[PDB]
Amino acid sequence: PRIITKAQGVHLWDSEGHKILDGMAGLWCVAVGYGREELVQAAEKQMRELPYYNLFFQTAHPPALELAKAITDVAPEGMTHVFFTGSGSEGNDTVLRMVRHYWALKGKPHKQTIIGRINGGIVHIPQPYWFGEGGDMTPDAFGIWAAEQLEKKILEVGEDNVAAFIAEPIQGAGGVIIPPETYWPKVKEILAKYDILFVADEVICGFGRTGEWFGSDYYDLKPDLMTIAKGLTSGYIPMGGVIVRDKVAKVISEGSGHPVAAAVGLENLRILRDEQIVEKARTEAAPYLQKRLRELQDHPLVGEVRGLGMLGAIELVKDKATRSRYEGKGVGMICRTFCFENGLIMRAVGDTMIIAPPLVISHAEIDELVEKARKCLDLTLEAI
Amino acid sequence: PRIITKAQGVHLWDSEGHKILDGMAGLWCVAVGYGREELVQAAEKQMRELPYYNLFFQTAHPPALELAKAITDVAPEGMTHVFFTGSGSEGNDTVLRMVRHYWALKGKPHKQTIIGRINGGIVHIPQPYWFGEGGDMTPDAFGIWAAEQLEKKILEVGEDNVAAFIAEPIQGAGGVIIPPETYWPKVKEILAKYDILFVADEVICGFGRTGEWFGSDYYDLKPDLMTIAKGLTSGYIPMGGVIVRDKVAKVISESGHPVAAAVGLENLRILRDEQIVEKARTEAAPYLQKRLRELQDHPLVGEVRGLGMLGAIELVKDKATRSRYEGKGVGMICRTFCFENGLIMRAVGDTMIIAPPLVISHAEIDELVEKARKCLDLTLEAI
């Protein structure tokens, strides 16, 4: 366990003066990067004024109402309400209660089952991970097939027994599973046929991570509920939320947020907008990040490099043609260790190395990342 | 009323300069009172060095670890572990899954049912509310009966099918339901007979509210799990948690946001180093309970009850029968007068309730009860 004494921009400094590039932005959290005093001052001002309370007695410009309006401004069309929580985990619980409450109010209490994906009361369908699970199929065909497994499960369970499909636009913690380009159009086509709610888990994809405001923007999804956290405050203060489409909010309405967290969240969103951090990540940072990341495709250890927006993944293989793994050898952990010893935070999911840098990472910092990553891929192979 | 421009000690100031005594401590949470700059500085400091992280990389003295130890320091017995959450509600969600997981890992997956109380997979037993439900029984005899309904319900569901009993030591949001003195002794007798977990809901009672550190302390309860929030940070930043007994944690074994934890750590340090819990018990609570009970002569008041830093006033139409102005919205009338006259009291039905900041002074207690009596006058005159 290394002791950090400073954090600024994309870098940590440990107690030994070693400078570390944080390629995971905290835990997918620190969108604007470390050391933005403005977020400190927003928490300090709100805590010093009136630390807590709402309705009957409130401050002049309550940050939560302004936060919700600002969230709905950058959210997909029709997403008009926001219910705030203390965390992303509390958000995903809140959302699953909302879908079942929604159907109960609609007079359909049998609509109880949540369909989710492997590695993403509850039933599961295959995740759209071509690299590990697609075999010799084309990405396009494996994406259509995986999406088709949602329809099968809806009919197997029974539409009148299904409440909702829940999914991250891109599975984060499961290994930056970027689906084939056929996947989401096919899922939309299936969702169009069935009276079930679609929950977009945007706790990782939300607030700039794909180059759009939300992963739902990236894939033109029209979810009914979106769970958010993390990037919402750039991780400076805990907070989650559920964004709700107008029709759903209308049903739930007939049958909130802490001010200090909301003040951090409002200021974090304002910075992302007024400094065009999201837009510049899409147009300037991500093109450089993805081109330079894939330059590692030549490495003997790298079976694949994938990524879009500010997400990236590097697969560690034993043979490239067959996409096999150094089974049992804990290659991911070994690579991660060398990463930590050479001032680079990547995380390992299996033998997948994943990165999600702060959105403000510069080209020069991207050069530092891919340089340190190749450096540790050599160290890993040599160690094997 | 409406726009608040300054909050200090036990008072809020609106934009026209009216000083309002917050008799509810935010919503049961502002234990140390408003305007404590130490908590601001703790959050500010922790936010600017490193905002967030877990293992592999950590700050020099991670606040969550110290806070766990500080909490267990003041917690009962062998409450050894703390698991942090973002809120009290998340804490209560976590504790219900913790008890069910505990019995799964022990190979008893049928132990699923949670026993709660009315006004507190789920089954309910009567709340120990003598004023509203005891009729003509003595409080002592009503309290025994209410507790005995816990045994009946365990046996009715079947011990093998019950995971846990969950209760606040004193129901807060339900209207400060202070039980008869015989209730918790009889409940402990019952719990001692059956192999179920006991969850004390301490979101409201924790961190000094009863004059002890916890409601479990006041009634010498030995819960297996305790849910906490609110006073833990004095509401300056949201946080919740679950304190776990050693035997539960050992089975469950087989992290909290650093800024929230840094605020909770300094808030706990203040409650201890300035003896705020102790002085509430020995100085503020007796004065408060005394002056509150002087309202019992008011024609509208059917009962004053209270212990520690909790208080309740029952508004009745007829004292002897304990009857209510049915349908006439009396509690809401009274609360509106309170707000207009610089006093925040919550209404639950026709009970007015208070839970002031623990630091409230005798002068401020005088202020509260002068204002309460004025509004009891205004309420009865409007009726």
Numbering used by the authors:
A (entry chain A): 34 to 153, 180 to 314, 324 to 452
B (entry chain B): 34 to 153, 180 to 313, 324 to 452
Provide passages from the article that reported this PDB entry.
A commercially available crystallogenesis screening set was employed, obtaining crystals under a number of different conditions after overnight incubation at 20°C. The best diffracting crystals were obtained in 0.2 M MgCl2, 0.1 M Bis-Tris pH 6.5, 25% PEG3350, then cryoprotected before freezing. There are two monomers in the asymmetric unit and the enzyme forms a tight dimer with predicted surface area of about 28710 Å2, with buried surface area of 3980 Å.2 Each monomer can be divided into two major domains. The large domain comprises residues 93–313 and folds into a sandwich of α/β/α comprising a core of seven stranded β-sheets with only β10 being antiparallel. The large domain is flanked by a small domain composed of two subdomains joined by a parallel β interaction between strand β3 and β14. The N-terminal subdomain forms extensive interactions with monomer 2 of the dimer which is important for active site formation, similar to what was observed with Cv-ωTA and Pse-ωTA. Unfortunately, all our attempts to obtain the structure of the complex of Pp-SpuC with PLP bound were unsuccessful. In the case of SpuC, the catalytic residue Lys289 is located on the loop between β4 and β10. Another disordered region of Pp-SpuC are amino acid residues 154–179 and 313–324. The homologous region 154–179 forms a “roof” above the cofactor binding site in the holo structure of Cv-ωTA, indicating its importance in PLP binding. The active key amino acid residues which constitute the small binding pocket and allow accommodation of substituents less bulky than an ethyl group are identified in Pp-SpuC as Phe23, Phe89′ (from the other subunit), Tyr154 and His155 (absent in the Pp-SpuC apo structure).
We earlier identified a putrescine transaminase spuC gene in Pseudomonas putida with preference to aliphatic diamines other than putrescine such as cadaverine and spermidine. A basic local alignment search tool (BLAST) analysis revealed a 76% protein sequence identity to a spuC gene from Pseudomonas aeruginosa, that was previously characterized to be part of a polyamine uptake and utilization pathway converting putrescine to 4-aminobutyraldehyde. In this study, we report on the detailed characterization (structural and biochemical) of the putrescine transaminase Pp-SpuC, and its application in the transamination of a comprehensive range of ketones/aldehydes for the production of a variety of benzylamine derivatives. We recognized the important dual substrate recognition of Pp-SpuC, accepting cadaverine or isopropylamine as the equilibrium shifting amine donor, and having excellent activity against a broad range of aromatic aldehyde derivatives bearing various electron-donating and electron-withdrawing substituents, as well as different heteroatoms in the ring, with excellent conversions.
